[PDB]
Design a protein around this motif. Structure first.
Motif, PDB file in Angstrom:
ATOM      1  N   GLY A  44       2.100  -4.700   1.153  1.00 52.03           N
ATOM      2  CA  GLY A  44       1.102  -3.984   2.076  1.00 52.03           C
ATOM      3  C   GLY A  44       0.851  -2.589   1.639  1.00 52.03           C
ATOM      4  N   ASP A  45      -0.397  -2.368   1.243  1.00 53.65           N
ATOM      5  CA  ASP A  45      -0.750  -0.887   1.059  1.00 53.65           C
ATOM      6  C   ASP A  45      -0.746  -0.022   2.007  1.00 53.65           C
ATOM      7  N   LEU A  46      -1.078   1.117   2.003  1.00 50.05           N
ATOM      8  CA  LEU A  46      -1.161   2.234   2.891  1.00 50.05           C
ATOM      9  C   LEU A  46      -2.455   2.583   3.444  1.00 50.05           C
ATOM     10  N   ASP A  47      -3.357   1.788   3.388  1.00 43.58           N
ATOM     11  CA  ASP A  47      -4.592   1.934   3.905  1.00 43.58           C
ATOM     12  C   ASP A  47      -4.707   1.230   5.337  1.00 43.58           C
ATOM     13  N   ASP A 100      -4.488  -0.869   8.206  1.00 45.14           N
ATOM     14  CA  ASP A 100      -4.426  -2.471   8.362  1.00 45.14           C
ATOM     15  C   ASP A 100      -3.421  -2.568   9.715  1.00 45.14           C
TER      16      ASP A 100
HETATM   17 MG   LIG Z   1      -2.705  -2.060   4.114  1.00 46.51          MG
END
Ligand SMILES: [Mg+2]
Lengths: 125, 1055
Positions: free
Chosen positions: B784-787, B789
């Motif tokens: 999972g990225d830090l954007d 979500d």
């Molecule tokens: Mg993310």
């Protein structure tokens, strides 16, 4: 057996000795000059590499550096051909008794008597 | 009856198929074997142990089984044990009366008159095969030496009639078969077999071959058998056989024959150029649905009376044609009364830029025809919002099956061996989809070109299309959206081209003088790159308070996803701030020329749910089936008590999504009314009682009270190292996981700490992650990225997984950078390459049914290959690498959770088996006189307007358009939940727009607060008292459009 079982064996040997040639023809495409053929792309000269059957046999004679993978491929495609001596013939055959017990000979010295001799390669000519 | 294929147990290996048949035709009768097939492990020289044989009739099979049951069939000193095996090597019906060999077949559209239907072309002799076991009817058509197959299944057949061609009294010569969707057109493209016919064919799919598109315009098949009067008993197996004697008249209809690839279009080439597009669009949409025939659509007098009458009075005659359920054969009869009844009884562009309600055009493309629907309400986009004049130019083009299903991998790029290595051979449907992506749909006076497609439109393939007018074109809007020539990889460019197509709202334009750079923070080690700062920004407090009042929230959002032109990511909020736009280094996607402030999700707290992968992963970490059954029991008790009690009805409704402190049915229960006194809230809660049970029997959907759905965040200073977040709920032992988890390594348990300094920062449902030391938390948790979500936390004392594991390498492959630029042809060849070789749900389905069947769940050698392939199957939109779902991994059987009738359903014994068997044993348990005229004039105006939402989508009685859930599903909606989730959104938007129109009608009906309170009493009296029951139905939604002022009557009558 009496009739048609030798004909089935002949028609199966003649088809198992024509697939072990196409197996060995596939192994000769592992040459670094053939790196553009094994890619996922459409080609135009692909029919010239599948129609020439005498040329791939002529290339196996000279330049003995790809002829070491054309013998080991036939020796691996002949294992499915030597296994025809168990479907054919009864269990009371005097060759399969002396071959399974390991007394004199093996399964390689029976397919040359019955079906086909195989391949013939020497050291240097 | 069932089949005729009988599998022999063990035939000897030194036997060819011309020797076994000579024995099979010795004990049985002569020529009684249709075809025999022996499987070969090699190509042509190694037969297997067993063999298959198909007899001609059923009595030969019943005799050969009785002969083999007594062990009397001895062949080459080897017994044969004949057993049943459903293989069907030749799809032929075993019946001498259901195998037609010569029958004339013609095609054409249905009749404009009563019994006079036209025909386009007629085949001179086909081979009609009527199967019964496989519900399909084949048509073998011969043309120019090629063999074609037309397969009509029983689902599209809606009516079956008998016709008369010769004209004698009560003679049976022809039959008329009606269709509504269309058939699938196949094409026969080319020692152990005895197929005594033309065989060894390959039935691959193809496009239309009947001249120039003469099949897709018909949707009606006519069969004329010479016998007729004898085979009337076998036609009762066809669905909906009408007992009627229909006449026939052959009329030549070669005027309607077209030459393009999109059929059936309204041929308005002789009508001139003075025609409105909005009339032709509805007249084209009413032809694909079985309402108006083709000759009535091209009549001169109906176009003449439509054009000699105003446009706003012309659309009301076309939208009322959907009210008729059957095929209206008299077209002028529905217009001559409507034009006399319309005289007794603006918002198209005013709803785009204010509350974002657009009227877009959708279209479905079958492999033989096209299907247009009409205008539908949907959330508007930023790409549409700036072009408020060209709202009639945007068009969604979907590419589906003829049965409106998903296109499989068998129609496109069928596999065929050619030489040494195999290669996918492209078919005609692939070149048809490529041609309609290159040219486009040309309907009316305009055409359509390719525009873009988002990353959420690849799954469920759809194409946004523009008309390419003289003002703006398909390239001008993409140049306005930015520049895509720098990105050389086509897979990333296709995702970056449609990243501005998401549902978002604009608040305030921000210029380029308020942009401050922020450096990147790396926590990389041992050659593996990580990024603690991945799309993290900072905003000033004053402009945050401005955009919070502009968007319409109560409190300030602590973190919200944003799209500043080409930027994409979430913004954190600090206290000491001096600028508004401060993006990091990992924010550039393309040239950010456009300046907008598009947001898609604010800072709000949802309750935590469960996923089936979460329960499948927690059951192999050291947790038995102890608390899951208790949680399901205390869920089922509250769901069985909510239909009887009131507090139990209010508890689960405030915890489920859709009632976030403001709802219609929540304020009705706030006064203290009984759930069964009035017949409105009872039927409103009746479907809400079964909604959570349907989400419990299909999905898991376990309510977890401890936790909150929160967005990821990051602190710029950095004090915490490997610690959790101080949460804010309107402590410790928290478990942090994202949704796409397959490996057992990405399980993460943390411990929350109480910080005396974080109360000044104000972090409300925003998890803070460390930014130093070793590998970070979310980048190693399911990639999972830090954007912006979702995240699932639980500070509960139930599970607590105390077993960590370092995950594997989450690094992807090398990106496929092309040499030259993207010339708009490699995008279509990538878009059609997503319909094939894309196994996303297949890998997760084959992994979910593999852990319950084998011990040591999520740790075996087979369960790890699917978890490794799931990292590549979900990253197709970023890197162009196929999933390549291999063989020898499907278990060839499914458990009792998904209930697919193809594979044999074995009895499951796992954590989900007791989770399903516990619920499965609980389904069989269960101004009082001054407002009379205005209400009597408004009730019919609400009711006949609500019928337009009732019968357009297929609601049951009243609740399927009010609550948005469908009672009786369809074929194309029972398996595609991703389209159902958008269908239930546009149902709710349409009923919300109708409620807003009712609220607008309310403002023009009252001037006093006493009148505003007394209108609700009359509007309750018209629809609640039984003395005003009319001939039509009375829906239970009339006191709910003004239901805010209706609760004050019950609060005033108490005192
Ligand atoms: Mg993310």
């Amino acid at each position: 057996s009496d009739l048609q079982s030798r004909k089935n064996l002949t028609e199966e040997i003649s088809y198992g000795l024509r697939e072990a040639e196409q197996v060995c023809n596939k192994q000769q495409l592992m040459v670094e000059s053939w790196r553009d053929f094994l890619a996922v792309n459409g080609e135009d000269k692909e029919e010239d590499s599948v129609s020439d059957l005498a040329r791939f046999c002529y290339e196996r004679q000279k330049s003995a550096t790809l002829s070491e993978l054309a013998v080991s491929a036939f020796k691996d495609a002949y294992r499915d051909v030597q296994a025809l001596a168990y479907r054919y013939g009864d269990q009371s055959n005097s060759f399969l008794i002396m071959s399974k017990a390991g007394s004199k000979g093996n399964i390689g010295k029976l397919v040359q008597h019955s079906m086909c001799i195989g391949l013939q390669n020497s050291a240097v000519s | 009856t069932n089949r005729s294929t009988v599998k022999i147990s063990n035939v000897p290996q030194t036997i060819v198929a011309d020797e076994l048949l000579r024995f099979l035709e010795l004990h049985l009768g002569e020529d009684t074997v249709f075809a025999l097939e022996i499987p070969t492990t090699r190509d042509n020289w190694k037969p297997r142990d067993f063999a298959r044989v198909q007899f001609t009739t059923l009595e030969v099979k019943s005799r050969a089984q009785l002969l083999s049951s007594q062990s009397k069939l001895l062949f080459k000193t080897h017994n044969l044990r004949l057993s049943e095996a459903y293989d069907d090597i030749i799809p032929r019906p075993v019946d001498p009366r259901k195998r037609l060999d010569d029958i004339v077949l013609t095609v054409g559209f249905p009749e404009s008159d009563e019994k006079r239907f036209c025909a386009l072309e007629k085949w001179d002799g086909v081979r009609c095969w009527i199967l019964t076991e496989k519900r399909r009817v084949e048509f073998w058509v011969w043309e120019s030496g090629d063999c074609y197959k037309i397969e009509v299944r029983f689902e599209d057949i809606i009516e079956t009639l008998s016709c008369c061609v010769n004209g004698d009294a009560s003679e049976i010569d022809a039959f008329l078969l009606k269709l509504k969707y269309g058939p699938k057109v196949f094409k026969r493209v080319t020692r152990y077999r005895f197929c005594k016919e033309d065989f060894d064919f390959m039935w691959i799919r193809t496009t239309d071959f009947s001249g120039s598109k003469s099949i897709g315009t018909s949707t009606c098949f006519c069969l004329e058998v010479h016998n007729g009067s004898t085979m009337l008993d076998i036609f009762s197996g066809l669905p909906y056989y009408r007992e009627d004697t229909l006449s026939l008249t052959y009329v030549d209809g070669k005027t309607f024959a077209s030459a393009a690839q999109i059929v059936p279009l309204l041929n308005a080439a002789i009508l001139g150029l003075e025609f409105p597009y909005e009339i032709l669009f509805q007249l084209n949409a009413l032809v694909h649905a079985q309402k108006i025939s083709l000759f009535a659509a091209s009549d001169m007098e109906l176009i003449k009376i439509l054009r000699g009458m105003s446009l706003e009075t012309a659309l009301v005659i076309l939208k009322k044609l959907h009210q008729q359920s059957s095929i209206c054969y008299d077209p002028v009869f529905f217009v001559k009364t409507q034009m006399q009844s319309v005289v007794k009884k603006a918002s198209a562009y005013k709803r785009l830029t204010e509350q974002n309600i657009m009227s877009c055009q959708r279209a479905y493309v079958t492999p033989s025809k096209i299907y247009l629907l009409g205008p539908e309400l949907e959330t508007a986009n930023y790409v549409v919002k700036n072009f408020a004049e060209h709202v009639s130019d945007f068009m969604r083009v979907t590419f589906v099956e003829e049965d409106w299903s998903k296109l499989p991998a068998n129609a496109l790029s069928v596999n065929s061996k050619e030489g040494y290595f195999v290669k996918p051979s492209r078919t005609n449907i692939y070149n048809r989809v490529l041609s309609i992506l290159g040219e486009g749909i040309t309907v009316g006076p305009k055409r359509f070109e390719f525009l873009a497609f988002s990353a959420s439109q690849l799954r469920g393939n759809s194409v946004w299309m523009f008309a390419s007018n003289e003002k703006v074109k398909a390239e001008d809007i993409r140049e306005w959206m930015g520049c895509f020539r720098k990105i050389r990889s086509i897979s990333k460019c296709a995702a970056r081209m449609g990243q501005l197509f998401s549902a978002s709202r604009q608040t305030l334009i921000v210029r380029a003088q308020d942009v401050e750079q922020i450096p990147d923070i790396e926590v990389t080690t041992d050659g593996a790159d990580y990024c603690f700062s991945d799309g993290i920004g900072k905003i000033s407090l004053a402009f945050a308070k401005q955009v919070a009042q502009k968007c319409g929230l109560s409190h300030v959002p602590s973190a919200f996803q944003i799209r500043y032109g080409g930027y994409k990511g979430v913004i954190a909020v600090d206290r000491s701030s001096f600028r508004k736009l401060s993006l990091r280094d990992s924010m550039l996607k393309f040239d950010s020329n456009n300046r907008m402030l598009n947001v898609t999700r604010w800072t709000e707290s949802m309750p935590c749910f469960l996923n089936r992968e979460i329960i499948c992963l927690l059951s192999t970490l050291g947790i038995e089936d102890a608390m899951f059954e208790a949680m399901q029991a205390v869920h089922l008790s509250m769901l069985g008590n909510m239909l009887e009690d009131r507090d139990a009805a209010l508890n689960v409704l405030q915890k489920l999504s859709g009632e976030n402190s403001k709802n219609l049915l929540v304020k009705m229960l706030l006064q203290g009314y009984a759930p069964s006194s009035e017949p409105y809230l009872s039927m409103m809660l009746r479907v809400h009682h079964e909604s959570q049970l349907s989400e419990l029997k299909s999905r898991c959907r376990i309510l977890v009270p401890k936790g909150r759905i929160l967005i990821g965040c990051m602190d710029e200073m950095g004090i915490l190292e490997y610690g959790q977040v101080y949460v804010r709920v309107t402590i410790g032992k928290v478990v942090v996981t994202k949704n796409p988890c397959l490996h057992p390594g990405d399980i993460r348990v943390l411990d929350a700490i109480y910080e005396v300094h974080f109360e000044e920062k104000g972090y409300l449902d925003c998890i803070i992650f460390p930014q130093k030391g070793e590998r970070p938390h979310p980048n190693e948790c399911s990639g999972g990225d830090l954007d912006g979500d979702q995240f699932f936390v639980s500070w509960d004392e139930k599970i607590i997984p105390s077993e960590m594991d370092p995950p594997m390498d989450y690094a992807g492959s090398r990106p496929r950078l092309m040499d030259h630029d993207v010339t708009l042809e490699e995008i279509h060849k990538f878009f059609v390459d997503y319909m094939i070789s894309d196994t996303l749900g297949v890998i997760s389905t084959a992994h979910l049914v593999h852990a319950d069947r084998d011990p040591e769940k999520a740790r075996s050698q087979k369960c790890l290959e699917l978890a490794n392939l799931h990292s590549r199957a979900v990253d197709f939109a970023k890197t162009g690498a196929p999933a390549e779902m291999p063989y020898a991994l499907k278990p060839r059987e499914f458990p009792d959770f998904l209930e697919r009738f193809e594979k044999p359903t074995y009895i499951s014994e796992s954590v989900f088996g007791k989770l399903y068997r516990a619920v499965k044993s609980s389904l069989a348990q269960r101004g009082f006189e001054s407002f009379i005229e205005t209400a009597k004039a408004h009730r019919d105006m609400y009711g006949e307007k609500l019928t337009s939402l009732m019968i357009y989508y297929g609601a049951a009685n009243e609740e399927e358009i009010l609550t948005g859930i469908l009672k009786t599903k369809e074929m194309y909606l029972a398996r595609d939940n991703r389209r159902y989730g958008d269908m239930k959104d546009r149902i709710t938007l349409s009923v919300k727009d109708l409620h807003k129109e009712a609220m607008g009608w309310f403002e023009k009906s009252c001037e006093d607060e006493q009148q505003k309170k007394k209108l609700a009493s009359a509007w309750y009296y018209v629809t609640y008292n039984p003395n005003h029951r009319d001939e039509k139905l009375t829906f239970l939604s009339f006191p709910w459009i003004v239901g805010d002022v209706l609760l004050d009557i019950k609060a005033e009558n108490a005192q």
